[PDB]
């Protein structure tokens, strides 16, 4: 919903409060770093498409079709 038009650190704090609703406070007090992702954009998906096409090329080159 909200990673668009919002900053990074306040997003981390907000979803960390959501985690505090789910986990224990003494638990997530004992974490190195709670990295929070973002949904993938268009250039990212073009690159992921290129990665999957490369592994497909490897499969059909072991099959023997360039």
């Amino acid at each position: 919903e909200r990673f668009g038009e919002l900053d990074y650190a306040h997003m981390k704090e907000l979803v960390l409060g959501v985690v505090s609703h789910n986990f224990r406070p003494e638990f997530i007090n004992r974490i190195d770093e709670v990295v929070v992702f973002h949904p993938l954009g268009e250039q990212h998906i073009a690159s992921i498409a290129q990665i999957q096409l490369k592994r497909l090329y490897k499969r059909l080159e072991e099959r023997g079709y360039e």
């Binding site: 505090s20 609703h21 406070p25 003494e26």
Partner: protein, 66 residues
């Protein structure tokens, strides 16, 4: 017939309040985690006595004890 230490820590967070509690614990009971830390910020609703003190049988705050 009264509790020994009753206080109210008034000041900004993270200044050593945790450090002061752990120093109190490390003298009075000779370990840092010879203590209990429980936050009360999550208990604004009616689900406070059912989550802090001890739950009714068969609801949300039950299967961790209390």
């Amino acid at each position: 017939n009264r509790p020994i230490g009753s206080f109210l820590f008034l000041g900004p967070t993270g200044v050593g309040k945790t450090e002061l509690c752990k120093a109190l614990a490390n003298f009075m009971f000779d370990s840092d985690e010879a203590m209990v830390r429980i936050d009360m910020s999550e208990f604004m609703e009616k689900h406070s006595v059912s989550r802090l003190v001890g739950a009714p049988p068969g609801y949300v705050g039950y299967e961790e004890g209390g």
